[PDB]
């Protein structure tokens, strides 16, 4: 049992009032250049925000002018430190052995929707990175392709529906061809 | 604004009053790692899979909660008890896998543009109310510091079943009905 560490929120000196703390680690290229950002919010106004690239706490609206000075004194140590002790340690010890190591296998299926329309229905994947083409007889069809946005079902999956507008002659070879990278080999589905 | 491969929202307290409402949740690229339930004082992992390997000590949601109360204290005065402006949630209903008779699926109700973090999200089957096999998320942050929230329905498609997703939220005059049919 390796422990997950929280970023610390720092204290102070029929109508509803609302306060948010958003601590946020920005990774790029491994842990090669981490960026720490803490923001403090009244209702929706962001009033005071530490950001590692600036390196101190700053006000963001007039409502945080007094807040700035105080935090810079009582935290700021420990807050510069957080990047190196729970932006990093979080990533290099709990993200590596979990999220950065989820693959979830996709899930391709075709069907006639209503000259009709064919719906390639690519479900259940993770990561979000995915490619989905329409081959009617061996070559790729550009026109009559209308995809959705990349739905996010928020259980750590995805889905996307690619749509081909067509008209069935004879019996023809239709192909939803699908590249993820939980797939070493491209799923390719056949239709009538 | 703001280039990166991965985003860890680690520590995300939210407190709103009156009524004492709080919510401590971590995220990774947009999906709920876990929330701390505040009565019982226990981490609650989104996919219990994540519960076997790593632990989060829950008292640390409590700490971030405590300071988040305090600064509400201070700020609410400071702003001249400017109170928050009630937003209209939007709903879209969709299904996880394509729809096929007799095979079980999941109905999804996703609500975005929530503010405040109080909403009511419920399910209708031919307009009689449903609770069994419902799961609902945490509040999930956005950019403009709203929230979005989704609830899930266990069904088994059929005919003619008619499915409504219903939203109650103070920003709405009258409950919104989200209507869906296979």
């Amino acid at each position, epitope marked *: 049992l390796v422990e997950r560490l929280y970023l610390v929120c*720092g204290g102070e000196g029929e109508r509803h009032f609302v306060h948010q703390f958003k601590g946020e680690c920005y990774f790029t290229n491994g842990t090669q250049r981490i960026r720490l950002v803490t923001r403090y919010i009244y209702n929706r106004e962001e009033y005071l925000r530490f950001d590692s690239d600036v390196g101190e706490y700053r006000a963001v609206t007039e409502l945080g002018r007094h807040s700035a000075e105080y935090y810079n004194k009582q935290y700021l140590e420990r807050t510069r430190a957080e990047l190196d002790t729970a932006c990093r340690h979080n990533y290099e010890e709990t993200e590596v052995p979990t999220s950065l190591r989820r693959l979830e296998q996709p899930n391709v299926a075709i069907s006639l929707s209503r000259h009709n329309t064919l719906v390639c229905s690519v479900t259940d994947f993770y990561p979000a990175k995915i490619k989905v083409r329409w081959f009617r007889n061996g070559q790729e069809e550009t026109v009559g392709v209308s995809s959705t946005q990349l739905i996010r079902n928020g259980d750590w999956t995805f889905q996307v529906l690619v749509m081909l507008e067509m008209t069935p002659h004879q019996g023809e070879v239709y192909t939803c061809h699908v590249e993820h990278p939980s797939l070493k080999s491209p799923i390719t589905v056949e239709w009538r | 604004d703001i280039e990166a491969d991965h985003v860890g929202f680690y520590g995300t307290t939210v407190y709103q009053s009156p009524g004492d409402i709080g919510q401590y949740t971590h995220e990774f690229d947009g999906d709920e790692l876990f929330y701390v339930d505040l009565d019982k004082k226990k981490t609650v992992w989104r996919l219990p899979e994540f519960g076997q390997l790593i632990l989060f000590e829950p008292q640390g949601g409590l700490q971030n909660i405590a300071a988040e109360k305090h600064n509400l204290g201070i700020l609410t005065k400071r702003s001249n008890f400017t109170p928050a402006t009630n937003e209209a949630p939007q709903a879209t209903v969709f299904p996880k896998s394509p729809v096929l008779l007799g095979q079980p699926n999941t109905l999804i109700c996703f609500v975005d543009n929530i503010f405040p973090p109080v909403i009511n999200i419920t399910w209708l089957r031919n307009s009689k109310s449903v609770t069994d096999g419902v799961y609902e998320t945490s509040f999930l942050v956005n950019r403009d510091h709203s929230f979005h929230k989704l609830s899930y329905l266990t069904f088994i498609p059929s005919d003619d079943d008619i499915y409504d997703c219903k939203v109650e939220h103070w920003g709405l005059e009258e409950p919104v009905l989200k209507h869906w049919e296979p």
Partner: T-cell receptor, first 109, second 111 residues
Framework: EQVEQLPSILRVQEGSSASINCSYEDSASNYFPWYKQEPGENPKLIIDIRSNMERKQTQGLIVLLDKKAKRFSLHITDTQPGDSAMYFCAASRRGSGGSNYKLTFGKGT | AVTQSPRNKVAVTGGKVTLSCDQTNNHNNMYWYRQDTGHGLRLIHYSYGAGSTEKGDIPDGYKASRPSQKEFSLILELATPSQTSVYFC???????????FGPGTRLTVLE
């Protein structure tokens, strides 16, 4: 198991340097600081360090950490009687936490 | 700041003792330490909030209570000569780091 202080009792000539060792479990801990209980008084904080670095030196006060050794320690220059206090060594999982949330405190000097 | 009444009590074996604290820092977590020469700075009980009280290092004969943010009270149900020591209070929180200790409390039991 947790933290051992040392030295237990210590003398020093008025004008010499003075040093307190420490070690931990704990495992890595990210908060290790110091406390000066004045004769017949409360403990008040003097200096701290996290695993972020290994050397802090602040207004006549010298603190060192070796993380991998599970080892840190405290030094002063050109002493007086004014720095004759019961000094207190503690260490803790910076936060989050926890069981080993905060402090601890070794036996004392 | 912190304070604490009593600042010195003298007790009677088989009595009830109560030492209050009352921090005013709006702080989250409070702790009762006992400082005895030889044995250091030992932790009796503590808390993370108004309501709950957790066992510390040396909670034998020490039943501890905390009714609110401000107040944290150490209770010695039944006195004995060995309960005799100094006693300290300290608060910290929202959100640290730095334990703020109380002025002190010198107790004495007798047979």
């Amino acid at each position: 198991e947790q933290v051992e202080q040392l030295p237990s009792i210590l003398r020093v000539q008025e004008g010499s340097s003075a040093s307190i060792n420490c070690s931990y479990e704990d495992s890595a801990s990210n908060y290790f600081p110091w406390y000066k209980q004045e004769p017949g008084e409360n403990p008040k904080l003097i200096i701290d360090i996290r695993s972020n670095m290994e050397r802090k030196q602040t207004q006549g006060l010298i603190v060192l950490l070796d993380k991998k050794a599970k080892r840190f320690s405290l030094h002063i220059t050109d002493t007086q009687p004014g720095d004759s206090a019961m000094y207190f060594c503690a260490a803790s999982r910076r936060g989050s936490g926890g069981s080993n949330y905060k402090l601890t405190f070794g036996k004392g000097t | 700041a912190v304070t604490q009444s009593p600042r010195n009590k003298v007790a009677v074996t088989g009595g009830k003792v109560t030492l209050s604290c009352d921090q005013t820092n709006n702080h989250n977590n409070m702790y009762w330490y006992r400082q005895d020469t030889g044995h250091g700075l030992r932790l009796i009980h503590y808390s993370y909030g108004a309501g709950s009280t957790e066992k510390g290092d040396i909670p034998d004969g020490y039943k501890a209570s905390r009714p609110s943010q401000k107040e944290f009270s150490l209770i010695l149900e039944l006195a004995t000569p060995s309960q005799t020591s100094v006693y300290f209070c300290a608060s910290g929180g929202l959100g640290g780091d730095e334990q703020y200790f109380g002025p002190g409390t010198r107790l004495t039991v007798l047979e």
